[PDB]
Design a protein around this nucleic acid. Structure first.
Ligand SMILES: O=c1ccn([C@@H]2O[C@H](COP(=O)(O)NP(=O)(O)OP(=O)(O)O)[C@@H](O)[C@H]2O)c(=O)[nH]1
Ligand SMILES: [Mg+2]
Ligand SMILES: [Mg+2]
Length: 1575
RNA sequence: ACACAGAGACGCCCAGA
RNA sequence: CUGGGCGGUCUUUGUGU
């Protein structure tokens, strides 16, 4: 409104008060844009501003009708003028008028507004206009303007006696205002409206006049030029497209675009679906005849009980019907030996011969111990002296023995799989193999598992506090905490050590040691009848090991003396052992590579589980309490899930989320958890699965009996009656939500056997059989009862029109013209090198079609970067130059080549499709187009990540403004069933071509046509076993169908005789058409929004219901939010019934668009909505922190030793942002320290105590020392902050200063201790197939501009390709799966073998000795110059470091937990602010004349002079840079100038609202522990 | 023991017996 | 049926935040 009243709200303090930006988004309902008639002449542009439509929102009232005219010299600034016309009309005032005159070159420039407040306080206001829909453009414009006007203003501040001043920047976009001023929402909405009108005017003027727009850079000009030339000269040969792919006639698209939607058909179908939905609701929820809620809930309970009994009977009928079983859940002994020193004690008082009379295992162990006593000890335990001799200045030694076992013993061992392939044809082996396939009865007695869960001794103190392993961990933790020695640190460390002395953790320690030994032994081989004997390092446990190979089972048997078992884990979930005379033995059990990662990570996992679940129960870390039943149940369930590690066990717990979401369903609807009974069917094979299924069904019946009570408490809504799904114990909502993710403790990366492959094929074939016979309802005509894969043309056009109307409301008319230019830009600028990646591409082709001539060959997937390099070799520069050849090859092939595999995920079974290079090239442009359209949609979240959050909290503001206080919010959280396989791609092509100009249409219709003939290669090993079995005897009809199709006994459409592939016409693939499907679902949600708004307007008896409707949607995942304000009690129930019917009708309206509603959808919940596993329970956002906590050890292979701590810091930050307190984050980091030291050889190397006690003297993260975070702010700051803190307090800074002096004479140094996995063999082969020159570095030294320019010729493209392959991203990308076992297998030789490389290879002990030798010449401290070179944010680090020194003690109080949990952002390390622009653009613009900045020559020279000061070796000549700097290569200099521009570190925190050093202190004092205030 | 409403794995490659 | 060879081995990881 007024210029002055906006400044009046601004508060000024002391000198230059700046503040922080605050984003405003479009929340209010806009009126229609006024009609604008534009005319141009040489005297200017005249616009006839029309009549603004008058709504009740008052928005846009400043827009008045007129014939205003702007001259043809500021015609490029209407967006800057009309947006701010009415807020800057106060003449012009330069800096020198109202500031002291300092004779620099900045005198003459003028800001937008300089208000004087008429009393002696100067406030300066700057305006900015951006056309970027993304929030990044707003931030870029804001930072550019504030950097342009910060330094001169700050200079003029210090020349005044009392400079009470304020600087503000206001940036306006299409759907966002970035301003640091207290500006109200109405003014922001007015700014968006003015921007929209100005942008429409400017686009209308530009579309008929070339010279209005300023001259764009010629790179952009050539980009749109080449894109337009391609799209206007691209002939897809539509005749061949129609003749090749089914249902690819362009007449379909012509009729879809030209024929308007049938209105009468739409209304009739809508009314029919309304009637059907009402009937379904009344039938399923017992609404008629009228009954109160008690009888309805009782009928629901009886129905749930009947359906549960039906499922149980059906499962029991297909099982072995055995009600009693002896099968342990934990296949490891419950032994808890007291850990001792390193020695072999096999002294049997009764002799080894007494072991011989105790069965096959007794005979085996007697012969093993006899061979050990009468043989060399070398091999049972690793030799310390040999490794000391090797380390002070590869081959693997294991003690192997060959027992002469009897035939009965060999038969018994073969029954367990030990050499079981030889004994396959024996009768007992055949009977065991037959019986192993049978399933378990649901009525099997599993009360022992419940007894273990309720009553266990897992959390009892083992009293092993002062044993060698925990002393080692204590020494390492103490040395890590010596740099942060506070009382609070001591309390949290004591809590960690108390958790370490627990029984379950002590058990898991030796279990992890055994798993590490097995992972090491997986690379060995043994002959027939030969075994390996090993002894665990810290425990008196002996292991007999039978290896087969690395990709198959590893067998092990355990043995201990009966006097060495100090205690045991109580419970009957453990497998039965063998009781010899004085020895306890274990039967042979098997493991794989994928099964070892849970056993290795078991101790840290259980420590994290204990800490997390004791925090969620409310007991502080510094308090000691006896465990309760809930803590024991949660910890024991985590224990059993970790040790079980099976997919079905995970799935049963995972489905409890959707089972328990039904308890939030509100009247008149009833909770319906029995809908999840379909997904609970399937074979049961373990007792834990049976127990979990029975508990799940009990929870289902209990929830169907009674919903969660909704309790209004003051102005906030809570829920009562929540409980754990498995335990059944009552708990709060947070613990119930977190307990849905206990199944995530199962290994995501589970290996897929051949047996399990065909079922994944079943997921693809079973949808192709449902293909419609006729294509009439595949895009041609209209149907009211669509079948599978079918949809209505009129409804599709109506949804497209609804989304087009909403897009025109948001971005204004002529939006398609702007979309055209942006699409042309994105297509033209991007080059073929940008598609090069280390991600697999398919090699399936015509040569692989017949199994007859490929039965001996072996198939592998190559990498996309190799094909990109092959294209670059042929002089291919731009992607759009290769689209034509790719499409021609695709059309000549006549199909689309795909190869399949199985995804490793925590949600069940899903397949993954990999395309070849040509299909990738053709699909990329379509996906770019669809992304550009989706970025225009105001409720599509895949392309707009902010919309994931903002719509939900802004719905409350919409409701408050439109209805007033006291509005009821009803939500539906929807899921789509079979999203990718359900969508016939003609629909997607029509939807995409609706939002494009016709010039792109012929491409889009062609490129999507190839999806209607997909040839997907199956695994060749699967066909090798399928070929030899002509007849199938399975009970799954798909197995007979595939066999008969392959052998030719049955004719099917998807498979032919003797082929390596399946054929698919319907559906799309996983995420290949992600953005196009998101656009389709956006159209559908816009149609639903308009339909619901019209239904609310018409009412149920002729008066409108006051309501606000919001929709949010992603790929297939969506939610609907409706707020209504009733005017009475009867009106309330009628309006709620009406809204419930509206939300229920979505399931029936979805098939008209080809979308099928999944049963996981939760409909009609009040004050509750879940969108992306982000649970909003009224004003309380709930995040499942356990989900991120269970993945805090999922590391990647890092060649550098200091990158492991970076990965740990990333995982710790992910845990912190998930909703964990700082003390929990510190305990998780303690577990991470234990994991890191275990992976270095703590339990596998004898030379660790020497390594530990001699690494104490040199705490270097490069050499393996773990830096621990500050407990009051754990996880907030990165690894570099801890490195900088260690440089300023520990003697590491002295070492770094000495190394810097050494490199000066004649972070960066932390990565100088490296290990090469497989000595870069395959990586080297990757360079031996391209023909890339080795002169690349010298050639780019000759031409540094290649590093800062897009492209000039194929030689430069080869140069940047060679730079790309010689990057850490390519290097750290060939690592395969199962990172933890492969990494820990190197922990047996890492310390004392020559494998480490230093910036000749040496050992870690050798490197530490050399560092200690050089540690006597260390002098002084680290220099301020390198204190800014190595740590650009170090000063910023300082303002955090001094802000944590006032929180040092464990003082505080337990306050009442005020629950208003929201998500907030904290900027702890901001952008480095001395230089206005980045150095990457600053150097490039001067050196090569590239307009990468927005500064004039004077400002550019000023920033150049500022860049001079810090580095001091910088030179204007690149040759002088080459011969005047430490960086010998331009590659290193480019990385240096990229990294010296430091990043801004921000943390997303979950907790009480933050009112913006104050924020950091507030979250430290609050988020240390829930319900506790620090100091 | 692993996988599985029985599709696999429980070693693979050679040289001579 | 005797002496041997076997790891970044292959399986294995796609499209978007
Ligand atoms: O890993 C992934 C997960 C999801 N997606 C994309 O997200 C879509 C839905 O992913 P989804 O997890 O919802 N599974 P869906 O196919 O809907 O069947 P259902 O289990 O019954 O719900 C899929 O169809 C893909 O398009 C991927 O592309 N990759
Ligand atoms: Mg959902
Ligand atoms: Mg889905």
């Amino acid at each position: 409104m007024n210029l002055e009243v906006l400044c009046g709200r601004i508060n000024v303090e002391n000198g230059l008060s700046l503040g922080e930006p605050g984003l405003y988004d479009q929340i209010y309902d806009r009126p229609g844009l006024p009609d604008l008639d534009v005319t141009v002449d040489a005297t200017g542009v005249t616009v006839d501003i029309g009549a603004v439509p008058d709504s009740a929102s008052q928005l846009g009232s400043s827009i008045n009708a007129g014939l205003i005219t702007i001259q043809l010299s500021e015609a490029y600034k209407i967006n800057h003028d009309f947006t701010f016309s009415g807020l800057s009309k106060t003449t012009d005032r330069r800096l020198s008028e109202v500031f002291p005159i300092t004779h620099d070159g900045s005198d003459g420039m003028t800001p937008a507004v300089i208000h004087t407040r008429l009393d002696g306080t100067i406030v300066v206001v700057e305006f900015s206009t951006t056309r970027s829909h993304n929030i990044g453009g707003l931030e870029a414009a804001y930072r550019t303007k504030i950097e342009k006007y910060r330094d001169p203003i700050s200079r003029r501040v210090d020349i005044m006696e009392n400079p009470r001043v304020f600087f503000g920047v206001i940036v306006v976009s299409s759907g966002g205002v970035l301003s640091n001023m207290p500006l109200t929402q109405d003014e922001a909405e007015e700014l968006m409206y003015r921007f929209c009108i100005a942008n429409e005017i400017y686009t209308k003027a530009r579309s008929m006049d070339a010279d209005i727009e300023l001259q764009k850079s010629e790179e952009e000009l050539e980009a749109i030029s080449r894109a337009l030339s391609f799209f206007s000269l691209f002939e897809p040969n539509i005749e061949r497209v129609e003749g090749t792919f089914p249902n690819s006639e362009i007449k379909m698209l012509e009729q879809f675009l030209s024929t308007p939607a049938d209105v009468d058909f739409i209304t009739k179908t809508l009314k029919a679906k309304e009637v059907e939905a009402y009937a379904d609701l009344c039938d399923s929820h017992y609404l008629k005849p009228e009954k109160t809620i008690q009888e309805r809930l009782e009928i629901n309970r009886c129905e749930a009980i009947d359906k549960t009994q039906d499922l149980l009977a059906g499962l029991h009928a297909r099982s072995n019907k055995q009600t009693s079983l002896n099968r342990g859940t934990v296949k490891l002994p419950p032994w808890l030996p007291k850990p001792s020193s390193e020695s072999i004690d096999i002294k049997t008082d009764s002799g080894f011969g007494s072991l011989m009379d105790h069965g096959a295992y007794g005979e085996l162990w007697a012969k093993c111990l006899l061979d050990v006593s009468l043989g060399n000890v070398e091999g049972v335990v690793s030799d310390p002296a040999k490794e000391l001799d090797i380390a002070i200045s590869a081959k693997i030694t294991y003690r192997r023995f060959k027992p002469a076992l009897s035939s009965s013993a060999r038969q018994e061992f073969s029954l367990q799989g030990v050499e079981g392939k030889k004994w396959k044809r024996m009768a007992a082996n055949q009977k065991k193999e037959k019986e192993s396939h049978e399933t378990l009865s649901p009525f099997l007695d599993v009360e022992d598992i419940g007894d273990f869960l309720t009553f266990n001794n897992l959390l009892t103190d083992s009293r092993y506090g002062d044993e060698s392993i925990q002393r080692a961990v204590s020494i390492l933790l103490e040395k890590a905490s010596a740099m942060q020695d506070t009382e609070l640190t001591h309390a949290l460390n004591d809590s960690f050590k108390r958790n370490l002395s627990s029984n379950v953790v002590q058990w898991s320690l030796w279990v992890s040691c055994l798993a590490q030994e097995l992972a090491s032994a997986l690379k060995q081989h043994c002959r027939a009848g030969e075994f390996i004997i090993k002894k665990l390092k810290f425990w008196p446990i002996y292991v007999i090991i039978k290896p087969t190979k690395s990709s198959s089972h590893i067998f092990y048997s355990l043995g201990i003396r009966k006097a060495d078992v100090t205690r045991r884990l109580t419970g009957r979930v453990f497998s039965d052992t063998i009781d010899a005379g004085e020895w306890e033995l274990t039967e042979f059990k098997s493991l794989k590579t994928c099964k070892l990662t849970n056993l290795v990570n078991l101790p840290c996992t259980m420590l994290n589980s204990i800490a997390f679940w004791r925090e969620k129960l409310g007991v502080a870390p510094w308090l000691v309490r006896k465990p309760c039943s809930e803590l024991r149940e949660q910890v024991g369930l985590t224990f059993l899930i970790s040790l079980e590690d099976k997919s079905k066990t995970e799935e049963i717990i995972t489905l409890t989320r959707y089972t328990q979401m039904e308890g939030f369903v509100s009247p008149p609807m009833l909770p319906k958890p029995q809908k999840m009974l379909g997904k609970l069917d399937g074979p049961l094979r373990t007792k834990l699965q049976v127990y979990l299924l029975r508990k799940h069904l009990d929870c289902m019946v209990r929830i169907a009996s009674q919903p969660f009570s909704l309790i209004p408490r003051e102005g906030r809504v809570e829920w009562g009656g929540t409980f754990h799904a498995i335990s059944g114990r009552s708990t709060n909502l947070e613990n119930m939500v977190n307990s849905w993710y206990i199944g995530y403790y199962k290994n995501k990366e589970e290996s897929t056997e051949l047996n399990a492959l065909g079922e994944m094929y079943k997921k693809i074939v079973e949808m192709e059989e449902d293909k419609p016979s006729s294509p009439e309802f595949l895009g041609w005509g209209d149907t009211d009862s669509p079948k599978k894969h079918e949809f209505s043309r009129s409804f599709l056009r109506a949804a497209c029109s609804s989304l087009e109307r909403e897009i025109a409301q948001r971005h204004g008319r002529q939006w398609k013209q702007n979309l055209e230019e942006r699409v042309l830009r994105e297509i033209g600028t991007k080059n073929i090198l940008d598609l090069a990646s280390m991600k697999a591409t398919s090699n399936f082709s015509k040569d692989w079609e017949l199994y007859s001539e490929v039965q001996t060959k072996e198939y592998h997937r190559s990498k996309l970067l190799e094909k990109m390099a092959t294209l670059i070799e042929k002089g291919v520069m731009w992607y759009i130059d290769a689209v034509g050849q790719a499409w021609k090859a695709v059309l000549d092939d006549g199909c689309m080549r795909i190869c399949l595999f199985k995804k490793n995920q925590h949600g069940g079974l899903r397949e993954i499709y990999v395309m070849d290079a040509n299909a990738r090239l053709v699909q990329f442009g379509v996906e770019t187009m669809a992304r550009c359209v989706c970025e225009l949609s105001p409720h599509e979240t895949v392309a707009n990540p902010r919309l994931k959050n903002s719509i939900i909290e802004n719905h409350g503001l919409k409701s408050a403004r439109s209805l007033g206080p006291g509005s009821i919010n009803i939500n539906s959280s929807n899921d789509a069933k079979k999203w990718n396989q359900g969508h016939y791609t003609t629909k997607l092509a029509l939807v995409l071509c609706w939002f494009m100009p016709a010039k792109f249409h012929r491409f889009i219709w062609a490129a999507i046509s190839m999806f209607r003939r997909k040839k997907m290669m199956v695994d060749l090993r699967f066909l090798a076993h399928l070929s030899s079995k002509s007849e199938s005897r399975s009970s799954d009809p798909f197995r007979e169908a595939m066999t008969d199709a392959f052998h030719g006994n049955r004719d099917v459409s998807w498979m032919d005789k003797g082929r390596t592939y399946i054929k698919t016409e319907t559906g799309m693939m996983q995420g290949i058409l992600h953005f196009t499907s998101s656009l389709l679902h956006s159209c559908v949600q816009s149609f639903y929004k308009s339909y619901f708004v019209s239904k609310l307007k018409e009412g149920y008896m002729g008066e409108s219901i006051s309501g606000v409707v919001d929709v949010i949607e992603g790929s297939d995942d969506s939610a609907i939010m409706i707020s209504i304000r009733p005017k009475s009690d009867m009106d309330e129930v009628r309006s709620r019934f009406f809204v419930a019917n509206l939300l229920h009708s979505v399931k029936f309206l979805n098939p008209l668009f080809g979308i099928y509603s999944s049963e996981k959808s939760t409909v009609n919940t009040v004050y509750c909505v879940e969108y992306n596993s982000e649970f909003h329970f009224h004003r309380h956002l709930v995040r499942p922190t356990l989900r991120w906590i269970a993945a805090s050890h999922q590391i990647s292979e890092t060649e550098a030793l200091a990158s492991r701590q970076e990965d740990y810091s990333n995982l710790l930050t992910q845990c912190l942002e998930g909703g964990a307190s700082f003390s929990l984050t510190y305990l998780i980091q303690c577990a991470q320290l234990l994991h890191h030291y275990m992976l270095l050889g703590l339990c596998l190397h004898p030379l660790f105590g020497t390594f530990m006690g001699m690494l104490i003297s040199d705490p270097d993260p490069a050499l393996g020392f773990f830096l621990m975070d500050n407990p009051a702010f754990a996880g907030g700051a990165g690894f570099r902050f801890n490195l900088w803190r260690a440089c300023k307090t520990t003697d590491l800074g002295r070492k770094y200063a000495y190394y810097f002096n050494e490199i000066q004479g004649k972070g960066t140094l932390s990565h100088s201790v490296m290990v090469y996995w497989g000595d870069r063999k395959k990586y080297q082969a990757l360079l031996n197939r391209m023909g890339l020159p080795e002169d690349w570095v010298e050639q780019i030294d000759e031409n540094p501009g290649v590093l800062y320019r897009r492209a000039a010729n194929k030689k430069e493209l080869l140069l940047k390709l060679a730079e790309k392959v010689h990057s850490p991203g390519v290097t750290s990308s060939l690592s395969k799966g199962h990172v933890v076992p492969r990494v820990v297998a190197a922990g047996v030789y890492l310390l004392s073998r020559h494998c480490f490389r230093f910036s000749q290879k040496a050992s870690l002990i050798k490197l530490l000795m050399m560092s200690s030798i050089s540690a006597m010449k260390h002098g002084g401290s680290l220099n301020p110059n390198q204190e800014r070179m190595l740590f650009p944010q170090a000063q910023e680090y300082d303002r955090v470091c001094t802000l944590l020194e006032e929180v040092e003690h464990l003082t505080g109080k337990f306050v009442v937990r005020e629950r208003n949990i929201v998500r907030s952002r904290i900027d702890l390390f901001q952008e480095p602010v001395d230089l206005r622009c980045k150095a990457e653009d600053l150097v490039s613009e001067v050196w090569f004349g590239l307009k990468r900045t927005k500064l004039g020559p004077r400002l550019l020279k000023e920033e150049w002079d500022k860049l001079r000061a810090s580095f001091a070796w910088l030179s204007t000549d690149p040759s002088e840079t080459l011969r005047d700097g430490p960086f010998l290569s331009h590659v290193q200099f480019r990385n240096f100038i990229a990294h010296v521009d430091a990043k801004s570190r921000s943390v997303r925190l979950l907790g009480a609202p933050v009112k913006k050093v104050t924020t950091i202190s507030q979250v430290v004092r609050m988020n240390f522990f829930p319900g506790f205030s620090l100091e």
